């Protein structure tokens, strides 16, 4: 006979604003306010403004503000037509909310309003709805995901050493990452990661090398080869008291598009040797024998589907093979990859697809096919820690959200801490069995 | 005849946990829950575990966790004795809440529980009380400070280039900062900061120098002298389209105690020249004639009070002289400095004193003497942005919260943006006139 305020979940006000990301570039933040008084606030990390296969964030291109990277247009979209089309809709109907935005932008790649406008409102909606339902976001997400009460704390792959285009060094591989698979909780995992990271700083200082950090919070020291990169990591893991293999495994992102040139893969820091697809695969395979590298991301160019079919054949039974640039969080590409035996894992970048509902759909397609889904950060992040709730609420099982420095990264580890505290063993931390290719 | 929930401001529960700061080290986070349903959550930045003049945070020293820097004991103090002494107290009585934690800790320097446990609770409490009072934190802080509805947006001093002990280079000065005094809003100031910061990266790339960032998000390139550090700042400012002097002024931190040996200041990147106090003060004077440096922090050693009395006589009319190490946010030391004409400004580190009530008293003592208070970050920060609300609610007029990268820094900038959105001209951005020594 009385209606609680929780039931007044119609949207009455949406606000957008230009805030700053962790590289100092603008991004969009939205607030969704419901009739009952509930508020959700979320921000989109940085994305791509150009590209033929993914959703595009909208940038102003005004040279007199932020070197052309203002997001006043995306923000005006949130404040004007997005808001106007969502006022009076039920925030609890996440899929209806996202559909209205998707249909109103009217393009395939969200370029009218920007994936940045649309994601920010999608997630702020979701938080506002969570609040109206009387529940934390990870619980709402699990409900929206069709998996109520089903949770896991994800195994993190933590950036530690950078190379390629992300460093002045002679390391070809773009990043090396550690995964604390022997931890029994995410809180333990985070601590092991921190300990290794601090021991690596000591290793690097003793070699006369720089310990300043890149975008993701890891080190980009002047290492002489791929081998020296892996050696300093092994040395730091041992100095922290852990055992490579059993406690900590390695993951990499080759970004192999960056060294692809005339159908060959060319590695500056191995004498400028050229490799065919296949020879590059054998090169990577040789690294997996010397070091317990269990996950390899973008190990060939996004166009090299014949080569990815080969690599997946050779390495796929024992090694997680993660499509980042391969799939760009695009389910039409993932679908076809699945049908053709291409990779066995996908990096999920929610602003590359641009709405919460579509993100859940991408994670589900992965999971139904036996692929793993790794929830990912971007280069430009914010304070916002929504990807932690996403990973728990979908039981994704893995996350890639940075080194253990910079609060753009660490706010996510902290949120995973707060989540596990509340959930305990209702969110098990499963360790190496999350990783495709293990048992 | 009906009592609203907001009147139910008694503390019913306090929760402490160990989370991770921006360098990967543990810190304390607290949540204060009130009877009416209000919750405030806050984290303490990293501080000192040792020292004889300041409040000390409490680290575990268990070498098997976080290289000895766990804060499980500080966390236990929150969950047990602090919680039990506060259940049933009125969170709106900030001074009383703080007084109970101080008296129960029972030491002069907060070493039993830790300044980390105390501050975290103190701020969580203030946020819970703000919610019970129906107001944002900046409004509540202003009421606690004795200055209801009086606000300003602070002029930021932004870390841009690091030297001394914070870099491998030949820059003796620990940091150079830019101040966008020409902006009319803190939103514009922030944008100017960004643009200068991005132009500086392009200048450093063209010179073949490293653009990876330190703790505060600025650069530590291998520059050969203090002159060169100042030249690349000048060049970046010009490439961004601003004018040194009018639009952007410079602030520095010598941390002169790092080169103070046998009563003399010994500067590596100046031939290794030795200087008396008096000569070092005339060396700084000359920099202030050659470049628009309007603020100098710790221009002499903390023990050199005769020196600081001389530097203040000479520079103090025209230059802001900021005590950091000199005062360590300790009102006993500040009062004595004020009586002896020592410096004209103070860096406020709220975790160095350890409570919100004493932080307000520090700022008041500075302002009543005509000193300026610059609200400060620490080297290990979190996502928490309370220092932004603090600066606005005390009308401090200046803030030192980092470069324009890393969300540990940029979260504060974002919060200043949200505050100025809501307040507009009720929070004037006063520019150059906030700075001690300007007309
Ligand atoms: Mg990649
Ligand atoms: Mg200093």
């Amino acid at each position: 006979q009385q209606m609680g305020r929780g039931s007044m979940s119609k949207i009455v006000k949406i606000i957008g604003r230009e805030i700053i990301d962790s590289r100092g570039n603008p991004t969009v933040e939205a607030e969704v306010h419901l009739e009952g008084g509930f508020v959700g606030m979320a921000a989109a990390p940085s994305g791509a403004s150009t590209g033929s296969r993914e959703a595009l964030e909208l940038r102003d291109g005004d040279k007199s503000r932020f070197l052309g990277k203002g997001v006043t247009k995306a923000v005006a979209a949130v404040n004007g037509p997005i808001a106007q089309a969502l006022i009076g809709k039920d925030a609890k109907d996440q899929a209806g909310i996202d559909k209205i935005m998707i249909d109103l932008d009217g393009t395939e790649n969200k370029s009218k309003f920007g994936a940045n406008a649309i994601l920010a409102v999608s997630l702020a909606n979701a938080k506002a709805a969570a609040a109206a339902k009387g529940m934390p976001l990870y619980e709402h997400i699990a409900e929206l995901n069709g998996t109520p009460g089903k949770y896991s704390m994800p195994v993190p792959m933590m950036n530690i050493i950078n190379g390629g285009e992300h460093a002045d060094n002679n390391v070809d591989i773009q990043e090396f990452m550690i995964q604390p698979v022997g931890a029994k909780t995410v809180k333990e995992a985070i601590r092991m990661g921190s300990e290794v990271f601090h021991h690596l700083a000591k290793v690097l200082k003793a070699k006369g090398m720089n310990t300043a950090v890149g975008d993701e919070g890891g080190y980009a020291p002047n290492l002489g080869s791929n081998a020296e990169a892996l050696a300093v990591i092994a040395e730091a893991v041992k100095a922290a008291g852990y055992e490579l293999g059993k406690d900590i495994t390695l993951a990499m992102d080759c970004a192999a598009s960056e060294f692809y040139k005339d159908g060959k893969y060319v590695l500056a820091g191995e004498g400028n040797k050229a490799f065919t697809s296949e020879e590059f695969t054998h090169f990577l395979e040789e690294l997996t024998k010397q070091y317990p590298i269990v996950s390899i991301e973008d190990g060939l160019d996004e166009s090299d589907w014949d080569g990815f079919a080969y690599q997946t054949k050779v390495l796929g039974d024992k090694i997680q093979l993660v499509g980042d640039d391969l799939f760009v969080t695009n389910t039409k590409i993932l679908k076809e990859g699945i049908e053709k035996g291409i990779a066995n894992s996908i990096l999920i970048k929610f602003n590359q697809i641009g709405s919460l509902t579509e993100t859940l759909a991408a994670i589900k397609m992965a999971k139904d096919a036996g692929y793993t889904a790794v929830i990912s950060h971007r280069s430009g992040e914010t304070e916002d820690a929504t990807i932690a709730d996403l990973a728990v609420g979908t039981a994704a099982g893995q996350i890639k959200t940075g080194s253990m420095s910079r609060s753009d990264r660490v706010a996510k580890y902290n949120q995973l801490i707060r989540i596990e505290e509340a959930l305990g063993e209702k969110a098990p931390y499963n360790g190496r069995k999350e990783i495709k290719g293990q048992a």
Side-chain angles (χ1 to χ4, degrees), chain A residues 1-263 265-331 333-439:
Chain A
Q1 310 209 291
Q2 192 178 21
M3 303 314 271
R5 280 180 214 163
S7 70
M8 308 179 279
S9 51
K10 299 199 283 258
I11 290 171
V12 289
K13 173 159 71 146
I14 298 177
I15 307 177
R17 72 169 61 86
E18 187 180 57
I19 60 168
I20 313 299
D21 90 0
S22 57
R23 304 202 289 179
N25 299 315
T27 192
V28 176
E29 171 165 273
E31 290 181 31
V32 175
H33 295 248
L34 312 188
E35 188 174 332
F38 308 91
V39 188
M41 186 170 70
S46 74
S49 65
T50 71
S52 72
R53 299 135 74 222
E54 67 204 276
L56 297 190
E57 78 176 354
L58 176 63
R59 299 273 163 190
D60 300 348
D62 177 349
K63 252 91 270 291
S64 71
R65 299 182 78 257
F66 290 110
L67 288 72
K69 299 178 200 259
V71 298
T72 66
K73 297 174 188 169
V75 168
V78 174
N79 286 319
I82 291 161
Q84 197 200 82
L86 299 177
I87 295 312
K89 308 299 169 175
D90 181 8
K92 300 178 183 168
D93 179 7
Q94 186 73 29
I97 293 293
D98 285 331
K99 180 174 154 55
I100 285 163
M101 293 191 285
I102 285 165
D103 291 345
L104 188 76
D105 168 279
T107 66
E108 201 104 49
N109 70 347
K110 299 184 179 51
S111 45
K112 196 187 220 255
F113 302 149
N116 49 348
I118 289 167
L119 181 72
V121 170
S122 191
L123 298 180
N125 184 75
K127 299 177 170 166
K133 288 165 70 171
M135 69 180 53
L137 180 66
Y138 58 82
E139 190 177 352
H140 181 42
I141 289 183
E143 280 180 352
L144 292 177
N145 195 228
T147 53
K150 194 82 175 49
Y151 311 114
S152 72
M153 300 314 297
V155 172
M157 63 176 71
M158 303 177 173
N159 180 99
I160 205 76
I161 291 289
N162 301 98
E165 297 302 289
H166 297 168
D168 268 62
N169 63 22
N170 212 52
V171 179
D172 300 293
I173 299 305
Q174 180 168 278
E175 15 157 15
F176 289 103
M177 289 168 279
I178 62 168
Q179 298 169 115
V181 292
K184 304 249 283 170
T185 65
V186 85
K187 168 54 168 178
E188 196 185 359
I190 287 164
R191 175 180 59 82
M192 297 168 64
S194 180
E195 283 164 10
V196 176
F197 167 85
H198 288 118
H199 273 110
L200 184 56
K202 297 189 207 305
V203 171
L204 296 173
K205 218 272 274 297
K207 290 203 207 282
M209 293 173 179
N210 191 283
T211 59
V213 302
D215 291 344
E216 310 91 344
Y219 302 118
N222 186 26
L223 288 154
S225 58
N226 297 302
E228 197 184 2
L230 291 151
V232 295
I233 292 161
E235 178 176 355
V237 165
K238 188 109 93 58
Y242 297 110
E243 195 156 284
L244 218 45
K246 197 235 286 277
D247 296 328
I248 290 182
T249 47
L250 306 174
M252 59 192 38
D253 173 13
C254 301
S257 54
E258 299 302 337
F259 41 77
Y260 190 57
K261 167 178 156 90
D262 284 289
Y265 295 92
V266 176
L267 272 44
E270 311 276 332
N272 213 252
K273 215 228 290 298
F275 293 86
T276 56
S277 287
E278 268 94 341
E279 292 159 350
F280 195 55
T281 292
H282 311 328
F283 174 82
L284 297 179
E285 173 177 70
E286 142 91 319
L287 294 175
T288 70
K289 298 316 191 200
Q290 296 172 232
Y291 286 103
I293 295 158
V294 296
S295 179
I296 305 183
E297 172 191 324
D298 282 351
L300 297 166
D301 186 82
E302 64 81 19
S303 76
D304 191 353
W305 281 51
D306 293 334
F308 266 112
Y310 184 83
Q311 185 165 293
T312 304
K313 266 209 316 207
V314 164
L315 252 33
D317 299 317
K318 291 170 176 132
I319 304 297
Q320 176 171 269
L321 294 179
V322 185
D324 170 25
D325 194 48
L326 174 62
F327 295 134
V328 292
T329 320
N330 186 325
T331 57
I333 310 181
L334 177 58
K335 188 155 205 289
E336 208 198 330
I338 289 159
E339 283 163 0
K340 282 165 166 145
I342 305 286
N344 57 29
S345 183
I346 177 165
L347 206 57
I348 303 295
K349 287 182 177 170
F350 64 177
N351 79 319
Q352 221 172 27
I353 190 41
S355 78
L356 177 54
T357 298
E358 291 164 294
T359 300
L360 304 170
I363 290 161
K364 183 182 197 317
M365 168 176 297
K367 279 219 178 79
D368 292 348
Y371 287 38
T372 54
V374 176
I375 307 299
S376 180
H377 64 7
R378 301 301 303 262
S379 276
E381 273 293 334
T382 62
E383 304 86 286
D384 179 290
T386 294
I387 63 169
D389 294 84
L390 183 58
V392 177
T394 63
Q398 292 180 76
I399 186 162
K400 176 195 184 180
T401 184
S403 207
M404 196 59 64
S405 82
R406 313 167 66 103
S407 291
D408 33 293
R409 305 309 128 167
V410 176
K412 281 72 156 169
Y413 291 123
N414 290 343
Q415 183 66 352
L416 290 173
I417 289 173
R418 303 186 191 94
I419 294 172
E420 190 175 55
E421 189 174 303
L423 290 179
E425 296 310 318
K426 299 179 181 75
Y429 176 88
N430 294 310
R432 69 199 302 126
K433 60 150 81 56
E434 298 292 358
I435 297 169
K436 193 71 189 183
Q438 303 296 297

